[PDB]
From a paper:
Cypoviruses, members of the family Reoviridae, subfamily Spinareovirus, possess a single capsid layer with turrets and are commonly embedded in crystalline occlusion bodies called polyhedra, which are formed in the cell cytoplasm and mainly composed of a single virus-encoded protein, polyhedrin. To ensure the delivery of virus particles to the target intestinal cells, allowing the transmission of packages of infectious virus between hosts by oral-faecal routes, polyhedra are disrupted only when they are exposed to the very alkaline pH environment found in insect midguts. The fold of all the polyhedrins is highly similar – a β-barrel core sitting on a base domain, surrounded by a common array of five helices (H1–H5). The strongest intermolecular interactions define a trimer composed of a cluster of three β-barrels sandwiched by helices top and bottom.
Author numbering:
A (entry chain A), B (entry chain A), C (entry chain A): 2 to 254
The structure:
Amino acid sequence: STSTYALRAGKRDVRREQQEIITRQINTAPYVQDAMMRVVVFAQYPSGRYKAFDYVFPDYLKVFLNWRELLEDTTTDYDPRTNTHRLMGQGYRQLIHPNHGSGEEPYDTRYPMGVIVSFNGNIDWTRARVEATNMHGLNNTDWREARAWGPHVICGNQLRKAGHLSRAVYVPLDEHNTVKVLATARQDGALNRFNGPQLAQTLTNNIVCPNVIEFNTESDVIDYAKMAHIAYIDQAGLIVASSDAYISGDSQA
Amino acid sequence: STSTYALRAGKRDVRREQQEIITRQINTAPYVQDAMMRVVVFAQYPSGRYKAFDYVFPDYLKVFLNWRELLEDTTTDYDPRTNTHRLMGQGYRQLIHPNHGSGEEPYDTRYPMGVIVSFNGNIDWTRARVEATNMHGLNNTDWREARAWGPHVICGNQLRKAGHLSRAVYVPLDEHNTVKVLATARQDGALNRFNGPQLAQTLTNNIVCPNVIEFNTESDVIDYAKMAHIAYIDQAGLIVASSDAYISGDSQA
Amino acid sequence: STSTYALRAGKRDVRREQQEIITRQINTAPYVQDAMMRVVVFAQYPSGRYKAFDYVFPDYLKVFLNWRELLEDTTTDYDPRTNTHRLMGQGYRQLIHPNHGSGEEPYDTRYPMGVIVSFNGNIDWTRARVEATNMHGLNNTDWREARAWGPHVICGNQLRKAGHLSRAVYVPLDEHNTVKVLATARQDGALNRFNGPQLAQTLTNNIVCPNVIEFNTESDVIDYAKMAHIAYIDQAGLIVASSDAYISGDSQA
């Protein structure tokens, strides 16, 4: 880093020390249990556009995105292009029930090339997980040997550190994949907030608030990430946004 | 109240006392834990029409309604008016990602002026809550200082008492708001049904059953409320429906 | 059954005994807690087509399907046929708010005649339940006397045994019905995985993965069932698919 001489007032510089306190509040308020956490799944489309599934939640997040939800210009598990009563054009059916569909092309170009998953806040980094599952949301072809997570679940340092508050990972997808994501609040020290008398609040306060937002180009995705103070990895593989606050920003450039 | 002379049969008037018992059953059966509770969010539209998000649930309710779900004539987070691939007409995008959208008008007239939230049953009135959050479902502009609820969450006597079984509140909205609602079953005396061996049932039995119903005019909303036995506040600010049962109805008019 | 003479190698027939072990793994891996379970609701339409709500989940499943979700060619609670701003054509409204709608026919032929519900895996068979509820998801006309389940909830041996791993039931529906389904993991012996320190995982790992798949004819439904290794009852009332694995298939035909 590049730093050099600086001056400040003496004991009377409470304005500066107050701003230092504020910087620390922004950086540690997320660790007060039942503070919000934020997880965003950014689908990267062939078209150069992107779509964010943006979740804010205070305790835990259980996400499954199926094939149609992942498509460009959908906002739910509903595809306006594809009237399911028509005999032709059933690409989704052809993928989830092999050789019983009728898509007009091998690769529906609305299906994403991959997702950037951004985890932010007081997350339990040891159990934060992503999986590219098959069409059914399974991590084994045979459900009878599938489990909550697969033997090679995406986790640990596959989630790139982006600051004390954030990690992000890029997950390539092929056309038969779906996406699962898990994040929970960090263990509350030696107390388990999912245990005993603490559970009711942890469970019932957990209103997950999802939004699906589209972006016409990555510049706009990156702007969204800096607006929302969340980690993001751009097309160049660089970490261009973070949840960590610095009192003078990137002043040691 | 207006009451006057009445007669009844003597010890043989079991029909009357049976009906008195039935009145009490309707009024107290909701307090038997794992009985249904009922919460309804009525969106009031500029058009004079309304839309109800009607939830019945036996243990707890965690609701977040985002911008598109709140729009007149939507039934999910999907807006048929707005094809998200078009460059023009992205009003939702303009609100949730400031100055990256293209709505055709400053105020999409399908967005509601406010909601009437109706809580009914054995609800924990001390932790029944509503918030008009921002587009992301946050109660602070900066998620890093946002929490499960805001410092000024709508609660307590902002929820108007409408009988022993019900409360209702009117919540004005501006166009960038979304709505969150929490209701849980009242503490089970000194036992916590969210604790220990009671939790499995409390958790897994809690199938929340949502319906989205539209009403062309308030007369029809009020009818729906009386059909469903739930509190409702009409345009005049009057409580015109309740969950409380009376053996002769409003006979002391 | 028809069986007759067979031979095998002696102590060196490890290939056979390995395949016997594999058969047993497929049959008992589902009993390792947090293994996947699979529940499918197959709607049978007047048109001879079917639609599957296919859920895989590791711990519990809480399903409510409302009227519009049940309709042929819907994939969410959204009906493209019916623009809710139009005065005519509101069949759903006419059912859920009696005599306030305007459907074009008494019976919307997209509404199913019944559902086949298929339960598979380490399910608690004593508390696996289905209900055909009314439009609101209630099992009593008056919610104040409704409960999490009705006095005549569909359960026990109404769920037909289809093997050690599976049961299935046919549930007739009339046009004002909706469908509720509950399945949970079997009690973990004398330990309760929904209790104490076990709960956090049981709760947060439970990502339910739903897909809605259509089938143009029952032959294709039956194929889907055999692909997915789940119980299914065909139009003839026969059990034509199962989760149970046999080392030589149905070799005692």
